[PDB]
Coordinates of C-alpha atoms and ligand atoms in Angstrom, one line a residue:
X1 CA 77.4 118.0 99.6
X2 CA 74.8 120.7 98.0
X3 CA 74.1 124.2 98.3
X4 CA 70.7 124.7 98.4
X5 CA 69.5 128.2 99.1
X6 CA 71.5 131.5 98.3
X7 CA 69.9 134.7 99.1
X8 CA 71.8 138.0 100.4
X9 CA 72.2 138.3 104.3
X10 CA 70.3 141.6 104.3
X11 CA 66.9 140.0 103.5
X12 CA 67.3 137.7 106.7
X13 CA 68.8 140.1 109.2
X14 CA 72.4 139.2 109.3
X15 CA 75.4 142.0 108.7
X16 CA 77.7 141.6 106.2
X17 CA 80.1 139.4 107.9
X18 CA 83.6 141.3 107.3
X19 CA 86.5 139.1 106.3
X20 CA 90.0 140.6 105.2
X21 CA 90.4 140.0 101.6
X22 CA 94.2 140.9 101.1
X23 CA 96.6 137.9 101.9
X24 CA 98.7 138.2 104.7
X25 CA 101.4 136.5 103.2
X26 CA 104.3 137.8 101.8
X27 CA 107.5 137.3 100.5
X28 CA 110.3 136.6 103.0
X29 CA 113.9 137.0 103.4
X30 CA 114.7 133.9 101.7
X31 CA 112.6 134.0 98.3
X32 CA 115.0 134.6 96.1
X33 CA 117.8 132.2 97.7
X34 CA 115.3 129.0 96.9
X35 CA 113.1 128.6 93.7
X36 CA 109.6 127.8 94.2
X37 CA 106.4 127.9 91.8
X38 CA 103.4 128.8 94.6
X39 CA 102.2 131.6 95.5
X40 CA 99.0 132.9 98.2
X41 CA 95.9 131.6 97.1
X42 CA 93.3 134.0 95.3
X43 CA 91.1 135.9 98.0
X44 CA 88.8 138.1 96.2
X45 CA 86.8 138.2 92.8
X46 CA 89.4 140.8 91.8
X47 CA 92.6 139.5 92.0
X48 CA 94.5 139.9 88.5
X49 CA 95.7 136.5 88.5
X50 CA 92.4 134.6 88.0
X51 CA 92.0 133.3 84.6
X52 CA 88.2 131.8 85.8
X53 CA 85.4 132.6 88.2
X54 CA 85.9 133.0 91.9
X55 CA 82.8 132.4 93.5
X56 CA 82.3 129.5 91.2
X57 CA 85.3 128.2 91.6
X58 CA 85.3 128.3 95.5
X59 CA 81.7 126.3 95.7
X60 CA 82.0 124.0 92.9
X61 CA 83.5 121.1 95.4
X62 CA 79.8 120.5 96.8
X63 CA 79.6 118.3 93.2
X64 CA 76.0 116.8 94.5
X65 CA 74.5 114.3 96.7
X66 CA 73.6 110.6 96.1
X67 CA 70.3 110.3 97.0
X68 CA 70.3 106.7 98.9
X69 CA 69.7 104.7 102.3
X70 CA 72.0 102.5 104.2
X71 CA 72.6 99.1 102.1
X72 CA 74.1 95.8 102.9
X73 CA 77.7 97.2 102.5
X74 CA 77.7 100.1 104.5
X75 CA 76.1 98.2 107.5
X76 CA 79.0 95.1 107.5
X77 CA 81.7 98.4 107.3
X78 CA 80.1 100.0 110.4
X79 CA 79.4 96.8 112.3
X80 CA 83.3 95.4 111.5
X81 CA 84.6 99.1 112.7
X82 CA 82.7 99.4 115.5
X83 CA 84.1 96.1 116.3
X84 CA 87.6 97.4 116.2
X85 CA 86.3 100.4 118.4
X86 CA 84.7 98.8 121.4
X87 CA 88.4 97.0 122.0
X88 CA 89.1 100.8 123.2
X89 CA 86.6 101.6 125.9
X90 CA 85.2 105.0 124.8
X91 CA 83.2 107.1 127.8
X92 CA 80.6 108.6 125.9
X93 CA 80.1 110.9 129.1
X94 CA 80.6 114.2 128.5
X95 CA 83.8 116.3 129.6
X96 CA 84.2 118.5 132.6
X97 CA 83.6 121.8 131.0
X98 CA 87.2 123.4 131.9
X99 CA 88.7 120.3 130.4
X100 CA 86.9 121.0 127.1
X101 CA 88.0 124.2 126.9
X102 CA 91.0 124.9 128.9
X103 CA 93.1 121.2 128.1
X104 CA 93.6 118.3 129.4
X105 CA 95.9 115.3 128.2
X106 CA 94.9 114.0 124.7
X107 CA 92.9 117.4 124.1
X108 CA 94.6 120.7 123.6
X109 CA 92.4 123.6 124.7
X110 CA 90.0 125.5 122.4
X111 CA 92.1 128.0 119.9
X112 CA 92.3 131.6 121.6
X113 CA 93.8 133.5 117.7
X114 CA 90.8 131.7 116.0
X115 CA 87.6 132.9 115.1
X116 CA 84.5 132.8 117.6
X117 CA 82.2 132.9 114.5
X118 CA 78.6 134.2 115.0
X119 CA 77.6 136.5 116.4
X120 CA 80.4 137.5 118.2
X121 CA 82.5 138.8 115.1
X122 CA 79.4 140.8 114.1
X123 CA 79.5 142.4 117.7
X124 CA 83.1 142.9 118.0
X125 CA 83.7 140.2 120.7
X126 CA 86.8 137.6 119.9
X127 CA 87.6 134.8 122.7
X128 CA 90.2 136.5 124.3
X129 CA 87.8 138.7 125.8
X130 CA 85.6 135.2 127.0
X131 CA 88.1 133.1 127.8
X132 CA 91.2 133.6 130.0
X133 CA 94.4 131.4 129.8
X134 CA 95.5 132.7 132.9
X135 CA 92.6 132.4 135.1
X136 CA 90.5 129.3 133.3
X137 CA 87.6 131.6 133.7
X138 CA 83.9 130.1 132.6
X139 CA 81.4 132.2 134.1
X140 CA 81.5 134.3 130.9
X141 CA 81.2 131.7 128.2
X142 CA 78.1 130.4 130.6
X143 CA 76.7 133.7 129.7
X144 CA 77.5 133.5 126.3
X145 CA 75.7 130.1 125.6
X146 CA 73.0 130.7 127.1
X147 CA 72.2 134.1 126.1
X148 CA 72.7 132.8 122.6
X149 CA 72.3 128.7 122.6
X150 CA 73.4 126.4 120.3
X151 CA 73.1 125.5 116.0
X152 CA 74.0 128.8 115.1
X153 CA 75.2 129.6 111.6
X154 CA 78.8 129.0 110.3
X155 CA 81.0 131.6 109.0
X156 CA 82.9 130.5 105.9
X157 CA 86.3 131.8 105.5
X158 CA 88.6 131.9 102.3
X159 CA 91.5 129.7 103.3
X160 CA 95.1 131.9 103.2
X161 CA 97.6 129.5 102.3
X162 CA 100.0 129.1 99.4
X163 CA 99.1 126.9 96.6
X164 CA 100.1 126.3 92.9
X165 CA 99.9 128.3 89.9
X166 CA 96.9 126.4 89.1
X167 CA 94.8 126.5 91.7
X168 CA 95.4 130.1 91.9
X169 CA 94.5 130.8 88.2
X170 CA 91.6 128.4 88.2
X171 CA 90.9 130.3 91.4
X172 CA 90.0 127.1 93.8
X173 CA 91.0 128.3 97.2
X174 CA 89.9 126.1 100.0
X175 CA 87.0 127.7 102.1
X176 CA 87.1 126.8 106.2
X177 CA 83.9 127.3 108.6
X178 CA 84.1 129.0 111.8
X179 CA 81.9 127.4 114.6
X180 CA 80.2 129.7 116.4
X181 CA 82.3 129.1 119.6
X182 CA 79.4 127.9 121.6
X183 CA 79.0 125.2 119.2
X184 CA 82.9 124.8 119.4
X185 CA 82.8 123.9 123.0
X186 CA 79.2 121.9 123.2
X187 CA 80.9 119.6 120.7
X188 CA 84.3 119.2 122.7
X189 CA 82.1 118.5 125.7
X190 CA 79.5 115.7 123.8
X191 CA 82.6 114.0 122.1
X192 CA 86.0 115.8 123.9
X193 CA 86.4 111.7 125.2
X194 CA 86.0 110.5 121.8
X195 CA 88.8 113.1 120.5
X196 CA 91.0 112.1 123.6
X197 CA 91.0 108.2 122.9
X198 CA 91.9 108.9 119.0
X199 CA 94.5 111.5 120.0
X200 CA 96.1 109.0 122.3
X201 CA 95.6 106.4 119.8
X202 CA 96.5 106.8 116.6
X203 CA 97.0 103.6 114.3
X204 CA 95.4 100.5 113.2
X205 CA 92.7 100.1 115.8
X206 CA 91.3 103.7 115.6
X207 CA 92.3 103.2 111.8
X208 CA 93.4 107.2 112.2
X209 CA 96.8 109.3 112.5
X210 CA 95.0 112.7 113.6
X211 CA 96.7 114.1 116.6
X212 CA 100.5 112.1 115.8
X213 CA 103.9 112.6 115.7
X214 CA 105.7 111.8 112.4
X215 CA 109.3 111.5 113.8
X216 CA 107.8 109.0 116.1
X217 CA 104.3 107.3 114.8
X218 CA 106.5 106.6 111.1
X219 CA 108.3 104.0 112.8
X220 CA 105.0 102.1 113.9
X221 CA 103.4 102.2 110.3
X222 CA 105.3 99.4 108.2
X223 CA 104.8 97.2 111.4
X224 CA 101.2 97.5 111.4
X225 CA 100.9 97.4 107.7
X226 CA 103.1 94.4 107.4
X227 CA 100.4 93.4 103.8
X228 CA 100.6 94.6 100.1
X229 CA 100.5 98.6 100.8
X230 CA 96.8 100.5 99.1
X231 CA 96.8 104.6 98.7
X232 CA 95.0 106.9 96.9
X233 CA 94.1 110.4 96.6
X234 CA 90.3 111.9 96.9
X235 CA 89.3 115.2 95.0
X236 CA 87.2 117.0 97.4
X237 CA 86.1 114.5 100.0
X238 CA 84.7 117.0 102.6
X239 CA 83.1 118.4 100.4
X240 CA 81.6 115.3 98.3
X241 CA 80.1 113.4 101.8
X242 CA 76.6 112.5 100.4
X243 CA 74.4 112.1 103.6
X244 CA 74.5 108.5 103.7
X245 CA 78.1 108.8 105.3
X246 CA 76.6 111.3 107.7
X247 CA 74.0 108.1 108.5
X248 CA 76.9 106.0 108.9
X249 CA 78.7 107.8 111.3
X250 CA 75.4 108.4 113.6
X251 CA 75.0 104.4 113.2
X252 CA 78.5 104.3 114.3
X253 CA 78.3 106.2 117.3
X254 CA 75.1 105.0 118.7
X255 CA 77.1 101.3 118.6
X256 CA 79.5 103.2 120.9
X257 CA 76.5 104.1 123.1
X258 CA 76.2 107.7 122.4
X259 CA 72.5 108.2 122.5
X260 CA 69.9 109.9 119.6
X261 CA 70.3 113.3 121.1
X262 CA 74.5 113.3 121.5
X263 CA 73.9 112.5 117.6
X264 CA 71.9 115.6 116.7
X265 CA 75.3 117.2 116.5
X266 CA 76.4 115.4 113.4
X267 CA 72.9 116.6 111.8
X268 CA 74.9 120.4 112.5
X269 CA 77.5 119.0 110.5
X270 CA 75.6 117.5 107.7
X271 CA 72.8 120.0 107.2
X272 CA 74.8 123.2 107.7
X273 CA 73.8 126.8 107.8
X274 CA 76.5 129.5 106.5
X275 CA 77.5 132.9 106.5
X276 CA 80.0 134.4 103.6
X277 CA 80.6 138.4 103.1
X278 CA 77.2 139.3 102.1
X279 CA 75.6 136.5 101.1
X280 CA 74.3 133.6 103.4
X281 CA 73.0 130.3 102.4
X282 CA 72.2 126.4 103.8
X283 CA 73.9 123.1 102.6
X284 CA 72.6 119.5 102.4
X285 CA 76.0 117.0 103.1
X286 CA 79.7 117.8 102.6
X287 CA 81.6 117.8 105.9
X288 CA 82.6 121.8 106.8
X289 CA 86.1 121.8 107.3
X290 CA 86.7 123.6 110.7
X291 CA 84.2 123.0 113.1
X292 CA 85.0 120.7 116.0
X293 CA 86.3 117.2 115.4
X294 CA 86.0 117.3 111.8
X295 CA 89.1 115.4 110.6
X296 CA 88.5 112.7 113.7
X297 CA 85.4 112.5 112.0
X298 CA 86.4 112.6 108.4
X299 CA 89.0 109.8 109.5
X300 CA 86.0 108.1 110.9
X301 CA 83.8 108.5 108.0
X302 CA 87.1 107.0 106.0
X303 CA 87.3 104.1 107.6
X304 CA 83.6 103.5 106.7
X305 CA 84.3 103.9 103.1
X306 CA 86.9 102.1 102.1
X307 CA 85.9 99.0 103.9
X308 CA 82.1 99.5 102.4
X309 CA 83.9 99.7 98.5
X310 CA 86.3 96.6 99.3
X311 CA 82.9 94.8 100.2
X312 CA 81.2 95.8 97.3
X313 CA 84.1 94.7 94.7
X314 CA 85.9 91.9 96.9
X315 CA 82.4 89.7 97.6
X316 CA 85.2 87.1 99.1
X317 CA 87.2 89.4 101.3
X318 CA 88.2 89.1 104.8
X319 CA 87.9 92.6 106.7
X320 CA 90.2 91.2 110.0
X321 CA 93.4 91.0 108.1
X322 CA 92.4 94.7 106.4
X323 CA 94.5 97.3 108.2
X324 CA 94.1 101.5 107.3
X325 CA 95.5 104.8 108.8
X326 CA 93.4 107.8 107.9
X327 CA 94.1 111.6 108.8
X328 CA 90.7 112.7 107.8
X329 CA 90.9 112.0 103.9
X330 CA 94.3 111.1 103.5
X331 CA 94.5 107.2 103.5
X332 CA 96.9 104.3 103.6
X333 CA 96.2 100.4 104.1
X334 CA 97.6 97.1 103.5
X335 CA 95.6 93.6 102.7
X336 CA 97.5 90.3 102.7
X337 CA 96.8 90.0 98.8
X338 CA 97.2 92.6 96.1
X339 CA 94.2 94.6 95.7
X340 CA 93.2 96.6 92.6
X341 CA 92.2 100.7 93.0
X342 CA 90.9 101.7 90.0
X343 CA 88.1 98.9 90.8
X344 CA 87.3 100.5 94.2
X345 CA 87.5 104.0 92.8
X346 CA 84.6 103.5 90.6
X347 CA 82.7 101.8 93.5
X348 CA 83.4 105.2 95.1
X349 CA 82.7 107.1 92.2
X350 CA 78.8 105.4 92.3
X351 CA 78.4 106.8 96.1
X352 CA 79.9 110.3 94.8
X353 CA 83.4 110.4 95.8
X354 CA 86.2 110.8 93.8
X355 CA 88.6 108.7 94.1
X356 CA 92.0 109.3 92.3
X357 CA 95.5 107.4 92.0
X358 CA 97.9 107.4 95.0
X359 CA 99.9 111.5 94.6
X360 CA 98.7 113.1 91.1
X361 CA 99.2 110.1 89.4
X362 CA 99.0 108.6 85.4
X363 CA 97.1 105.1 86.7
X364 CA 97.1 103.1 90.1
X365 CA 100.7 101.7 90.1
X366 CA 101.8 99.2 92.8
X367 CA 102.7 101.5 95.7
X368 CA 105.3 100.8 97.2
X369 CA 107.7 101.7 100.6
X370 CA 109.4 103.3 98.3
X371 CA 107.2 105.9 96.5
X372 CA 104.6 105.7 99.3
X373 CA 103.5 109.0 101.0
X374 CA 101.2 109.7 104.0
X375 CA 100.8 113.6 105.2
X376 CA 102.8 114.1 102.0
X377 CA 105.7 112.6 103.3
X378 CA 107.3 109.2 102.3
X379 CA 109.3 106.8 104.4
X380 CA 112.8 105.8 104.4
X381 CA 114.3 103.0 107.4
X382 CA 117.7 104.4 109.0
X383 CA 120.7 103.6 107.2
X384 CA 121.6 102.3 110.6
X385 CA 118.7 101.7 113.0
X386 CA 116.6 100.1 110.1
X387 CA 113.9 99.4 112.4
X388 CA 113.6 102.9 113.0
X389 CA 111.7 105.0 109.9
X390 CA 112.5 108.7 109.2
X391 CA 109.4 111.0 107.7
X392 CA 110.5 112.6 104.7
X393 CA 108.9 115.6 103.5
X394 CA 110.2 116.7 100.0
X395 CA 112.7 119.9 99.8
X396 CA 110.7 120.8 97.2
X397 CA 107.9 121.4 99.9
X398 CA 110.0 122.9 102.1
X399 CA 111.5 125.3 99.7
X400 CA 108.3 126.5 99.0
X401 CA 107.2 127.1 102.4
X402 CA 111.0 129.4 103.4
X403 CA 109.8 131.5 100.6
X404 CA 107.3 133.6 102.4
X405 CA 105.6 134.3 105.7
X406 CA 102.6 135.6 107.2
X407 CA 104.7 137.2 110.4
X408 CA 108.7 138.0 109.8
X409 CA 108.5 138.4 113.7
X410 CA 108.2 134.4 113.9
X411 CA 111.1 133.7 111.1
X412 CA 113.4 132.0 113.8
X413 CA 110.6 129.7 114.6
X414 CA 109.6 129.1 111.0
X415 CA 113.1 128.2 110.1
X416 CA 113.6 125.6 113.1
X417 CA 110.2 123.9 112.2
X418 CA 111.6 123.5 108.7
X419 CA 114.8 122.5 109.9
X420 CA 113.3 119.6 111.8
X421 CA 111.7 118.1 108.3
X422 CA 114.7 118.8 106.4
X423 CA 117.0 116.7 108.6
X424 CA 115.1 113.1 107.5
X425 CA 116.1 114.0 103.5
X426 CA 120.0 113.6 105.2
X427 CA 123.2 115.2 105.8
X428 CA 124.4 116.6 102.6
X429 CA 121.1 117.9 101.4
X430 CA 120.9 119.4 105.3
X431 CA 124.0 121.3 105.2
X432 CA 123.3 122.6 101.5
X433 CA 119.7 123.8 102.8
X434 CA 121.5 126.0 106.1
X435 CA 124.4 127.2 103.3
X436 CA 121.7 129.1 101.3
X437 CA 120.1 129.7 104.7
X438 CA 123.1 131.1 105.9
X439 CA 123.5 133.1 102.5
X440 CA 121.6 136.0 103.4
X441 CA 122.3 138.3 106.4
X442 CA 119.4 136.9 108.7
X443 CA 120.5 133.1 108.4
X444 CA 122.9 134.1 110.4
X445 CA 121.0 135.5 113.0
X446 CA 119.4 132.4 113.9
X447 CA 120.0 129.9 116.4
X448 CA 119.8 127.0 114.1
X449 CA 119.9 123.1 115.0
X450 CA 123.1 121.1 114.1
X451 CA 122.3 117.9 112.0
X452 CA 124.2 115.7 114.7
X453 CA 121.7 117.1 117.7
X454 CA 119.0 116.6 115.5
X455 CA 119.9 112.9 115.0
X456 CA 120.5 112.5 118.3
X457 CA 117.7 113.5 120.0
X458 CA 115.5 111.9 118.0
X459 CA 117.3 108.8 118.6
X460 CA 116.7 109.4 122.1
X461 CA 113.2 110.1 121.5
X462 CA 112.6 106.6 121.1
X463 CA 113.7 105.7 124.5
X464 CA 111.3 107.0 127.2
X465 CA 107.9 105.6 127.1
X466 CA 105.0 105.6 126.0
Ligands
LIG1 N1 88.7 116.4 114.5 C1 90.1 116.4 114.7 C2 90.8 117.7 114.3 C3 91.9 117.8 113.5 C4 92.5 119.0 113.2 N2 93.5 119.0 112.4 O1 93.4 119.3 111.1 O2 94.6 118.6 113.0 C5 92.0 120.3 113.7 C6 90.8 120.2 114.6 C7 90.2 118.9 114.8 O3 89.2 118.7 115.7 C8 89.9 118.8 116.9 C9 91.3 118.3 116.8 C10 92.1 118.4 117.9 C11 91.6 119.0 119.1 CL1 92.8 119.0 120.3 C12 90.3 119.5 119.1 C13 89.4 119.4 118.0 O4 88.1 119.8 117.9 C14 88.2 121.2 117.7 C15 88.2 121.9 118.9 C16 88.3 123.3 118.9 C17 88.4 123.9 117.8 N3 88.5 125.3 117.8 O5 87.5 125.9 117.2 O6 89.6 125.8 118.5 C18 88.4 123.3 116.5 C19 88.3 121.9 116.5 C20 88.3 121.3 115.1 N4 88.7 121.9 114.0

């Protein structure tokens, strides 16, 4: 991706677009009781803790664009995918409006607490006062798209979230765009089917996990990746999707049967208009991270790649006994025979990604089950029930997460969420995590699961269908 044209809002009409430029995060009950090294992610060009440029830092993923058509490669990738695709039976009919926005199974409805984006955050007007949950109201929002339409600008906020020490210093906060909300709900309606078959289908044949269940989908993985494991990291893949992929994915979709037209929508996508602060400005490539679909799509997109770079090194190889799981840039597969990374990385390094070994990582090492990680957990079988496989998110990550909070109000929650990762690290490491829980007056406060219910019911989770 590449920005293209920066001038000041002003000059073109728009307000400055207000975003709130203190974090909302701050330190909880329990950040002294556990040791952790991250902190909120820089906000604004002032923060004291930069040791480098903020607005440079904060647009300096959109690396460039690779200026190039369709080739041989890219055309087997889409035709072998789309392959894999049609076995699913995808309406590309649009969706019943109050499904699209209000829910419906394999779609939960639109996101009240988000932003609406432009214009209604210039003019005061948030989606709560559009939409109803209550009373599934749309005569409103059929106001509000018409009166205003559809391909309206994007509003790019800074990304509150913790991160470490340096990627606050060097100041490289994620950004995330805001769809105006009419685009938001066109888009569920022109795909909202799409989404539903993927949610309802994560694995080997959508070749994505967006929309799973780690507790449950972890036990599926080794089964369908039964070959010799591949995984590897990307630095800034939304952000470094030349227009090519963009082609692809059209390509791919119109195989599906969406037409021309039901496509325009990834031309939004691709060739985006934004709005930050005070400034506004226009970008060729680089998926924005936010608007509708966009890790079904980065998933999508994914699936496109790897299978394109494998062709392009592997003149020999045999796609049907390939097998990937992508949640949007985060990818594992399995081929019968080993397969070598760095060779594909600098494939992918001559279409403009970057490609990087599996977690940070000194060369591309054999991955194993064992230091395998997907969603940055790993896997570990059951000491007893080996077929079943437990997700296992570090402590370390979990440590660092206790530590703060954007809402004390929620801490009972918070805690419970954690407690249901930190049960798959085991027993002793779970009782150790509720002592120092425990070790401050809240802890105690809490209504806090017992390993043995936790291990129980997700033993029975495996039970009743599906
Ligand atoms: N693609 C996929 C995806 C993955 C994540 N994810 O990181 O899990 C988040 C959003 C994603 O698109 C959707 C995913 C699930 C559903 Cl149920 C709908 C999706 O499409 C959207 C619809 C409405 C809004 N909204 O403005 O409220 C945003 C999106 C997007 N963003």
């Amino acid at each position: 991706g590449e920005i293209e044209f920066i001038e000041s809002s002003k000059d073109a009409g728009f307000p400055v677009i207000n975003t709130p430029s203190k974090t909302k995060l701050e330190p909880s009950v329990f950040h002294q009781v556990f040791e952790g090294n991250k902190e909120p992610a820089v906000l604004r060009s002032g923060d004291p803790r930069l040791k480098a440029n903020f607005e440079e830092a904060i647009f300096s993923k959109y690396i460039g664009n690779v200026n190039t058509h369709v080739d041989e490669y890219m055309l087997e990738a889409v035709d072998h995918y789309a392959g894999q695709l049609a076995t699913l039976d995808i309406s590309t009919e649009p969706m019943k409006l109050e499904d699209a926005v209000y829910g419906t199974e394999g779609l939960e409805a639109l996101d009240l607490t988000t932003s609406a984006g432009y214009p209604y955050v210039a003019l005061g007007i948030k989606k709560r006062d559009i939409l109803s949950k209550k009373t599934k109201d749309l005569t409103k929002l059929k106001e509000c798209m018409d009166k205003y339409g559809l391909n309206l600008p994007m509003v790019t906020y800074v990304k509150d979230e913790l991160r470490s020490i340096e990627k606050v210093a060097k100041g490289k906060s994620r950004l995330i765009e805001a769809s105006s909300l009419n685009d938001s709900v066109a888009m569920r309606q022109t795909f909202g089917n799409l989404y539903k078959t993927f949610h309802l289908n994560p694995g080997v044949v959508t070749g994505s996990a967006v929309g799973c269940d780690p507790d449950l989908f972890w036990s599926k993985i080794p089964v369908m990746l039964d070959g010799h494991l591949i995984a590897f990291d990307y630095s800034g893949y939304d952000a470094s999707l030349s227009p090519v992929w963009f082609a692809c994915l059209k390509m791919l979709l119109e195989k599906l049967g969406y037409t021309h037209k039901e496509t325009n929508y990834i031309d939004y996508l691709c060739n985006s208009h934004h709005l930050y602060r005070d400034k506004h400005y226009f970008v060729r490539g680089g998926m924005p991270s936010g608007c509708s679909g966009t890790s079904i799509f980065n998933s999508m997109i994914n699936n496109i790649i790897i299978r394109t770079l494998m062709l392009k090194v592997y003149k020999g190889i045999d796609l049907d006994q390939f097998r990937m799981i992508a949640y949007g840039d985060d990818v594992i597969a399995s081929y019968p025979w080993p397969i070598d990374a760095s060779l594909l990385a600098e494939a992918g390094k001559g279409y403009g990604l970057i490609m990087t070994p599996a977690d940070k990582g000194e060369c591309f090492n054999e991955v194993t089950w064992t230091n395998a990680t997907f969603l940055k957990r790993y896997f570990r079988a059951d000491e007893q029930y080996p077929f079943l496989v437990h997700p296992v998110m570090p402590m370390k990550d979990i440590h660092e997460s206790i530590r703060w909070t954007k809402d004390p109000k929620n801490t009972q929650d918070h805690v419970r969420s954690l407690c249901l990762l930190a049960w798959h690290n085991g027993e002793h490491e779970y009782e150790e995590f509720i002592r120092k829980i425990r070790s401050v007056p809240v802890g105690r406060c809490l209504t806090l699961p017992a390993f043995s219910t936790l291990r129980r019911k997700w033993l029975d989770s495996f039970h009743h269908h599906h």
